[PDB]
Enzyme design. Sequence first.
Site: not given
Ligand SMILES: Cc1cc2nc3c(=O)[nH]c(=O)nc-3n(C[C@H](O)[C@H](O)[C@H](O)COP(=O)(O)OP(=O)(O)OC[C@H]3O[C@@H](n4cnc5c(N)ncnc54)[C@H](O)[C@@H]3O)c2cc1C
Ligand SMILES: Cc1cc2nc3c(=O)[nH]c(=O)nc-3n(C[C@H](O)[C@H](O)[C@H](O)COP(=O)(O)OP(=O)(O)OC[C@H]3O[C@@H](n4cnc5c(N)ncnc54)[C@H](O)[C@@H]3O)c2cc1C
Ligand code: NI
Lengths: 452, 451
Positions: A3, A33, A40-41, A46, A49, A111, A173, A176-177, A257, A304, A433, A438
């Site tokens: 059923h 089961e 396996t996972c 998975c 690992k 089964a 896979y 290497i892992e 494999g 797989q 950035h 990026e």
């Molecule tokens: C602490 C901090 C963290 C940040 N982190 C991130 C982040 O991780 N990711 C991200 O995308 N952005 C980040 N930013 C923002 C990003 O730095 C700015 O959006 C970006 O630098 C803007 O570029 P810009 O050309 O408009 O100005 P700027 O890069 O500041 O260039 C303006 C330049 O013009 C010069 N200047 C000014 N006046 C004159 C003048 N009249 N004559 C000649 N030269 C002049 C200045 O000396 C300066 O070199 C961060 C900013 C701060 C301060």
């Molecule tokens: C070392 C390793 C690392 C892996 N890492 C990743 C990863 O990082 N990311 C990812 O996506 N995949 C990974 N995989 C692959 C992933 O584990 C399998 O693709 C996934 O488990 C497959 O699911 P499944 O249902 O097909 O089989 P399984 O998950 O293995 O399930 C089958 C189940 O059926 C049972 N069974 C078997 N025969 C019978 C029976 N006749 N009667 C009743 N029960 C039974 C078994 O005991 C088992 O529990 C990895 C595999 C390995 C071996």
């Molecule tokens: Ni039944």
Amino acid sequence: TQHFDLIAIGGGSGGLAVAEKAAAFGKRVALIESKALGGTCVNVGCVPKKVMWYASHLAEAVRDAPGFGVQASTLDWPRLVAGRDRYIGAINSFWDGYVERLGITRVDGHARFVDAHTIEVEGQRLSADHIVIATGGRPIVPRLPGAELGITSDGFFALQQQPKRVAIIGAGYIGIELAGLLRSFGSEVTVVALEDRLLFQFDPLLSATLAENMHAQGIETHLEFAVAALERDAQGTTLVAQDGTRLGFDSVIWAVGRAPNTRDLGLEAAGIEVQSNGMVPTDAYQNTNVPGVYALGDITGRDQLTPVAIAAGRRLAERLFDGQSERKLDYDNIPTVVFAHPPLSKVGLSEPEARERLGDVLTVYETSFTPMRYALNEHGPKTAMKLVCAGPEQRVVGVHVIGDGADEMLQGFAVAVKMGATKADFDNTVAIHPGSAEELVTLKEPVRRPGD
Amino acid sequence: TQHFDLIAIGGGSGGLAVAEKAAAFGKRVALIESKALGGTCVNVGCVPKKVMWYASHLAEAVRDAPGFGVQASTLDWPRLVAGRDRYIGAINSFWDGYVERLGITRVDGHARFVDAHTIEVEGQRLSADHIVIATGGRPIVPRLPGAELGITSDGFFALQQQPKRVAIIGAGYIGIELAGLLRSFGSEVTVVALEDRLLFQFDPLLSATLAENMHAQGIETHLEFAVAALERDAQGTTLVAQDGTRLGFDSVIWAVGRAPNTRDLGLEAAGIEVQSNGMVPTDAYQNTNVPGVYALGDITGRDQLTPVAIAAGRRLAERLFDGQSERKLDYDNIPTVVFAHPPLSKVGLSEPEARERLGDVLTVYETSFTPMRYALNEHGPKTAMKLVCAGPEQRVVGVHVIGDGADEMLQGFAVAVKMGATKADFDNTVAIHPGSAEELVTLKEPVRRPG
Ligand SMILES: Cc1cc2nc3c(=O)[nH]c(=O)nc-3n(C[C@H](O)[C@H](O)[C@H](O)COP(=O)(O)OP(=O)(O)OC[C@H]3O[C@@H](n4cnc5c(N)ncnc54)[C@H](O)[C@@H]3O)c2cc1C
Ligand SMILES: Cc1cc2nc3c(=O)[nH]c(=O)nc-3n(C[C@H](O)[C@H](O)[C@H](O)COP(=O)(O)OP(=O)(O)OC[C@H]3O[C@@H](n4cnc5c(N)ncnc54)[C@H](O)[C@@H]3O)c2cc1C
Ligand code: NI
Ligand SMILES: NC(=O)c1ccc[n+]([C@@H]2O[C@H](COP(=O)([O-])OP(=O)(O)OC[C@H]3O[C@@H](n4cnc5c(N)ncnc54)[C@H](O)[C@@H]3O)[C@@H](O)[C@H]2O)c1
Ligand SMILES: NC(=O)c1ccc[n+]([C@@H]2O[C@H](COP(=O)([O-])OP(=O)(O)OC[C@H]3O[C@@H](n4cnc5c(N)ncnc54)[C@H](O)[C@@H]3O)[C@@H](O)[C@H]2O)c1
Ligand SMILES: [Cl-]
Ligand SMILES: [Cl-]
Ligand SMILES: [Cl-]
Ligand SMILES: [Cl-]
Ligand SMILES: [Cl-]
Ligand SMILES: [Cl-]
Ligand SMILES: [Cl-]
Ligand SMILES: [Cl-]
Ligand code: NI
Ligand code: NI
Ligand code: NI
């Protein structure tokens, strides 16, 4: 006993997902089961690992801290595992309770299909209108001499102590892992691979950059290295190649494999179509060839990944139980992260893939740089990014990044790519950035145009 | 002397950007700078701050490492300063060399307009067909008694030693970023703010979470606190509110806004319209009221960000010197990060802004959680997220996040929002697991609906 609206085989990512949604639409759900919920996972994939990944991230952080004037001084692996397991345990506990809370009938055991619409679990038979197969996979151990001297990723997460000299066989896979984790923790790490580059499925820019980062971190690699056998040496274990080349490891990890858990599921009893490799074919809506039978997750042979299993599950339940007859997962442009150190991420097609699937229509933008995270450090790992574009309009068909922050970078880009974003869409978006992301919106001159 | 296609006033983000692109289109370009190239961002803004932000990220990483089994360990501020400044120097050097490489005529000193198409710098007069004002801003020091006892953000980056007990006046961007830098370096920090919440311009959920994070990290805050004066006490300086409340500080930092550098610029003489706050009004194409005169960057009073000055400049150069007569910057949905610890980020409208601009039409999604980054730590900072959606189609009009990773999270989300992403667009895209960003595409039930 008959059923039930739904039987979900497997309490992993896909099984839990379909069971959960079905139960929320007020359906009667059984969940089978054999081991622990979360699958396996949660248990050996998975989550453990990623927890260990943060430890390695933090270890790299303490190494790089003095460079920035932060006065820091090595891994207690038992503490890491204990903490990791408590955390994992808590997610298991959640799911155990959640399933009971939802009213799902949990059935412990393995089964098997007995016919097209019934399963047997330790002698108990159960039928349903809809049976969802989500049995997942398990690591492949090759049928080679002394292969049992090596462990798998499952074995890796069982390790109670940190191994000092590691060999990793496979550069997908997990290879290497695992390599990145262990080297970060100060182990000797060698990885070997069949291919001419690491992470073969990924874009050559990521493969190449990863190799550089890994070489810089002290990881030894051997490419085009086919393991013929594993053997016991004086205190340790040895890798033996095709040509006879030898390599003294206290741990060798197979990362070549995973195979689908479909071997004795009784699929032939039910008449369910299955491939020689164990994958169960499905249509876009997870339908097998047997009406009322569905497959999702790893056994379907598609991306797989956990969120793929989950999404496939939720949408299936929407289709079956919420009258959303057209509901299905889109399998294009599924984002992924490989948790190397630093990690990598991609959505969409690599250059070679896009060149395969589309013509000589590619406009490719790329860049390399050391991120500000390493401004006050000696030799930070390089970030690398590639935008793969197609057509005159330059639709973005691939986004690829490796470097600091890559693990959190691409989720939103996945949205844009799914919406059909072009280069113009990227370029008209104002940069954040400073940061790394990026760079994906301020690529100016392309490295390759149609014709290259 | 008069044969210039362009004079860019200010060698900061906007001036450099328009000069560079004009130079690249083969134009004859003069660039006037009174101090260092790179402007605020390179010297006293984005870059120094981000360098120090990393030191702060690493100090926190050092604190959290034992929890993860990493056996670790205190800031050598001079070492930080020395490294930061060396890094900064390289960028100034790059620009110095770059401007020379592009063939831009650099002129040192303060430019003033002498007429609609002429400027004077230390006596030399120079005309051009196009004059771009990009003089940026400077920190505001209020006209209060003993205001001069405090320093500004400029003074913050000049400090050679770490202050022990700091008062931050202002809870905008700078005040929050500085507060978080100092506190994670172990200084005592209290921030005071005129408003009833920190980061007033931002979405209340970001403000409320930031307050929590900041309290949890030991930062003391005083809301609705109007400083009337700064007086000397027994070692240190005191804050006096206008009700009479008294706060003994090592240094007091004004972070109460920035003022545009347009007071001694000869705008009167050229007939260029200026507001009383010093901002130079422009149209959508950076045109002032006098043809041939343009303004960009901070003095335009739009989004005070580096990349906004850059984009505005590049697009203006494309318009003026490349016949792209319709080119302009879109000022909608500029993404931004505030570099607190942990940072926050947003693109688009906050909930109050969206209700204000679009009415009672909002579907709002929210979540809050502790990321796996703090899985083995005792009390990690909260992550919080909000999707602001409008209409029946639920177009995404606001995306807001505070927490670990927020600084690299939203760039791609800005692209999507720029394209008019709906909630469906977010939900149809598969999550990356495990991480934080996936929470933005897996928001199920809304907290508020129209009504
Ligand atoms: C602490 C901090 C963290 C940040 N982190 C991130 C982040 O991780 N990711 C991200 O995308 N952005 C980040 N930013 C923002 C990003 O730095 C700015 O959006 C970006 O630098 C803007 O570029 P810009 O050309 O408009 O100005 P700027 O890069 O500041 O260039 C303006 C330049 O013009 C010069 N200047 C000014 N006046 C004159 C003048 N009249 N004559 C000649 N030269 C002049 C200045 O000396 C300066 O070199 C961060 C900013 C701060 C301060
Ligand atoms: C070392 C390793 C690392 C892996 N890492 C990743 C990863 O990082 N990311 C990812 O996506 N995949 C990974 N995989 C692959 C992933 O584990 C399998 O693709 C996934 O488990 C497959 O699911 P499944 O249902 O097909 O089989 P399984 O998950 O293995 O399930 C089958 C189940 O059926 C049972 N069974 C078997 N025969 C019978 C029976 N006749 N009667 C009743 N029960 C039974 C078994 O005991 C088992 O529990 C990895 C595999 C390995 C071996
Ligand atoms: Ni039944
Ligand atoms: N971070 C994540 O999202 C994550 C992590 C781990 C795994 N996964 C998923 O699980 C799957 C696991 O795949 P995987 O990484 O285990 O393997 P894989 O299929 O990705 O890689 C195959 C590797 O096996 C190696 N190999 C095979 N036989 C060999 C031989 N005899 N000698 C030397 N090398 C040999 C090859 O060199 C090759 O590099 C992935 O496809 C992925 O989808 C995901
Ligand atoms: N990460 C970044 O992208 C970044 C970082 C810093 C700054 N910026 C840019 O620089 C600009 C300037 O930032 P800001 O923070 O200096 O300006 P702001 O307008 O944000 O600061 C206003 C603050 O001044 C305070 N104030 C004023 N008078 C007061 C009084 N007498 N008593 C108590 N408090 C008083 C108010 O409480 C308020 O909090 C921002 O608009 C921003 O765009 C960007
Ligand atoms: Cl309930
Ligand atoms: Cl059995
Ligand atoms: Cl099996
Ligand atoms: Cl890392
Ligand atoms: Cl050149
Ligand atoms: Cl002068
Ligand atoms: Cl001035
Ligand atoms: Cl931080
Ligand atoms: Ni029957
Ligand atoms: Ni001239
Ligand atoms: Ni004249």
